[PDB]
């Protein structure tokens, strides 16, 4: 019963930093989709082929 | 005094020579296989036996090619030209080999035995050899470009 | 093997054009104008000159 | 293997998890979790508690070589050394729990 | 073999000496018979065998040299131990 | 004669025509399909390199693409390259069409989400005006020492399109592994888009730490005992990245200062 409350212990937070490392690099990773959601309207990459626009608003495959 | 006659003679009867012997020992390989790589090397200028080594992806090829830096390396200061020089004998002697334990299936053990050899190689320089020019892809430069 | 091979049958081995090729031919090779290195022809090397015009 | 000669080098070291960089003891602070124990955590639990566990032989350090100075194997591997410590106040019991007179 | 459709002599040195390497001729009671005949000049120049250098692989100096050489699929085990337990 | 010379089914050989004859067996004859698990020595397959299991073949396609597009040169070994020249012409068949239907059919075949985040950035903006043959297959020349397996240099084609590799030298790989690549001194002047130079620091910050730093140390005790020749002892390792080496970098982010 002290090597039984050990083990929870181990996992109760092997979770509890699994819950920052997880939750920390999604609260990054949407970071870069802004700095990329920024960069990407000055340079005008519309990211979506070599076509203009004209091809999305058909709604389409083209 | 005689004795040290001779080994001064028989000194003196060989450095003068247009030779430069050469023994690299331990190379790791067995005899059958580093020296059938051998015999395609016995008879060829040192820029050529130099060429056809770093390109071959044995291993014989790249001990001996060890052997013709370092050699040459050596032979040039003997006087040896580093240009004209020749593979007069490149020899392979056999050398050491260890016992290693196997161990086969079923309770039954051979011994294998890690083999290593000797390397004789003899560059002797061959006063009129021309080292012919290697600039043109191999033969490129006909049959493939069109006549004229 | 029911018998042992005296040379003249392993001579034999290195008489077709089995060993001759595999062993026993010599590359064809030049300089490569750009590294100075012996070089075989179809290959080059991994450097931005030899990469876009093949030496 | 953007080696072009693979070997024990060039073998692209984690060409997976790209979230690095993980600060466990200011993230242990966060948690209240005693940071020598939280970094424990994420190493096999032979090289911290006291545990049966395997040791490659390299590892364990040489003796004074020739070559080398006597290489223990600690100095070498400093945040691999047992905290028993740690091991104790977590694993074993303690005279204190059962003293019963 | 070789032979460029001219007949070298054969392959030297090579292929019939791999058949049947000479037993070694050893010494009774430590003795060399015809010592007492033969010069004492270095054995080098005696038979013939005279070699400017006799680099040495089996040195801690070309150990760098060595590895240079042996196929990186010729992996060698006990680095860092032995089997037998060298304390006894 | 009235039936086929050969019945149904009989496998020809790796160089062998098409010989067309009335059959109900299906072949393709042509691959002109994007991103493909049709890996084989026929006309409509590309070119099955070796691998333990069909899958494992396609999990070692997708670590070959995501890091052809990671970084534009991969020097892939073997019929590898056949087999990836076909998939960088094919992912950029993929990052042209654009459709949130493509950017997916690349989303479940990339092992990282960043990578399609690129490739369908610089790659409509690089080939916007080539239509095929996306790929450079050069052959290295020295065979591999491990074994005698070619080695071809597949790269992808004009760079100096780019915005991600403008100007980037491959003469020689990066030093540490987690450091960025050699420029062009004469466009020794360029920038990168931050999300690409962001995100990768982000990856290449464990490395610069000393739990790898041990992982490292440790790494050599393994090669050890799995011996492998040539591996030096975990005890003079002294590190990849280092405080002398923290110093230029932070300074090298004057950028946000
Ligand atoms: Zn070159």
């Known amino acids: 019963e002290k090597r039984i409350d050990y083990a929870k212990k181990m996992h109760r937070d092997r979770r509890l930093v699994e819950q920052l490392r997880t939750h920390e690099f999604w609260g990054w990773y949407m970071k870069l989709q802004r700095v990329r959601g920024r960069w990407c309207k000055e340079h005008g990459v519309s990211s979506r082929g070599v076509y203009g626009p004209a091809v999305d608003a058909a709604e389409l495959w083209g | 005094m005689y004795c040290e006659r001779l080994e001064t003679e028989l000194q003196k009867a060989q450095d003068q020579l247009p030779q430069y012997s050469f023994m690299m020992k331990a190379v790791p390989s067995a005899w059958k296989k580093l020296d059938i790589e051998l015999s395609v090397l016995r008879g060829l200028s040192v820029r050529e036996a130099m060429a056809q080594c770093k390109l071959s992806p044995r291993k014989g090829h790249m001990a001996v090619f060890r052997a013709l830096e370092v050699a040459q390396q050596g032979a040039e200061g003997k006087g040896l030209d580093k240009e004209h020089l020749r593979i007069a004998y490149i020899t392979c002697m056999p050398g050491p080999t260890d016992k290693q334990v196997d161990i086969r299936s079923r309770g039954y053990y051979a011994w294998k035995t890690k083999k290593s050899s000797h390397l004789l190689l003899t560059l002797a320089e061959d006063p009129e050899m021309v080292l012919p020019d290697r600039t043109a892809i191999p033969y490129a430069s006909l049959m493939t470009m069109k006549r004229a | 093997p029911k018998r042992k091979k005296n040379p ?31 070089k075989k022809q179809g290959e080059w090397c991994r450097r931005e000159d030899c990469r876009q015009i093949k030496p | 293997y953007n080696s072009f000669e693979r070997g024990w080098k060039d073998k692209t070291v ?28 994420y190493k096999p639990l032979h090289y911290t508690y006291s545990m049966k566990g395997q040791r ?46 | 073999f070789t032979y460029t459709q001219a007949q070298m002599y054969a392959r030297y040195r090579t292929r019939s000496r791999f058949y049947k390497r000479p037993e070694k001729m050893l010494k009774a009671y430590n003795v060399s018979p015809n010592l007492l005949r033969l010069p004492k000049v270095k054995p080098g120049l005696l038979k013939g065998i005279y070699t400017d250098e006799k680099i040495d692989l089996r040195d801690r100096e070309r150990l760098e040299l060595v590895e240079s050489i042996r196929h990186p699929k010729e992996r060698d085990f006990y680095q860092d131990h032995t089997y037998h337990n060298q304390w006894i | 004669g009235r039936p086929p010379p050969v019945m149904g089914h009989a496998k020809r050989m790796r160089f062998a025509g098409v010989d067309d004859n009335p059959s109900v067996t299906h072949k393709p004859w042509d691959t002109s399909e994007p991103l493909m698990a049709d890996y084989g020595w026929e006309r409509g397959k590309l070119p099955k390199f070796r691998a ?153 910050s464990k490395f610069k730490t000393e739990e790898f730093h041990h992982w490292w140390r440790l790494r050599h005790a393994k090669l050890r005992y799995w011996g492998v020749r040539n591996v030096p002892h975990p005890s003079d390792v002294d590190p990849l990245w280092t405080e002398k080496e923290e110093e230029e970098w932070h300074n090298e982010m004057l950028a946000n200062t």
């Open chain 3, 8 to 38: 003249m049958q392993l001579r034999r081995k290195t008489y077709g054009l089995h060993f001759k090729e595999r062993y026993l031919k010599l590359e064809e090779w030049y300089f490569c104008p750009l590294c100075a290195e012996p």
């Open chain 4, 14 to 41: 984690h060409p997976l998890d790209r979230r690095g960089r993980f600060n466990l003891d200011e993230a242990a602070a966060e948690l209240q979790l005693d940071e020598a124990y939280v970094a424990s955590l």
């Open chain 4, 56 to 101: 490659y032989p390299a590892e364990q350090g040489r003796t004074s070589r020739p070559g080398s100075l006597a290489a223990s194997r600690d100095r070498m591997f400093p945040l691999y050394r047992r905290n028993y410590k740690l091991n104790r106040e977590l694993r074993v019991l303690d005279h204190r729990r059962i003293s019963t007179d």
């Open chain 6, 52 to 204: 333990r299991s069909p899958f494992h073949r396609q999990q070692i396609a997708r670590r070959m693409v995501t890091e052809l597009i990671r970084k534009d040169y991969v020097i892939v070994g073997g019929a590898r390259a056949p087999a990836l020249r076909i998939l960088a012409d094919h992912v950029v068949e993929l990052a042209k069409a654009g459709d949130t239907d493509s950017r997916q059919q690349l989303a479940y075949f990339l092992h990282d989400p960043l990578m399609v985040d690129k490739a369908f950035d610089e790659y409509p903006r690089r080939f916007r005006d080539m239509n095929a043959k996306y790929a450079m297959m050069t052959r290295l020349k020295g065979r591999r020492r491990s074994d005698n397996v070619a080695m071809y240099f597949v790269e992808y084609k004009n760079r100096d399109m780019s915005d991600n590799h403008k100007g980037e030298d491959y003469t020689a790989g990066p030093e540490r592994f987690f450091l960025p690549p050699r420029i062009i001194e004469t466009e020794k002047g360029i920038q990168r888009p931050p999300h690409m130079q962001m995100a990768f620091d982000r990856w290449a």
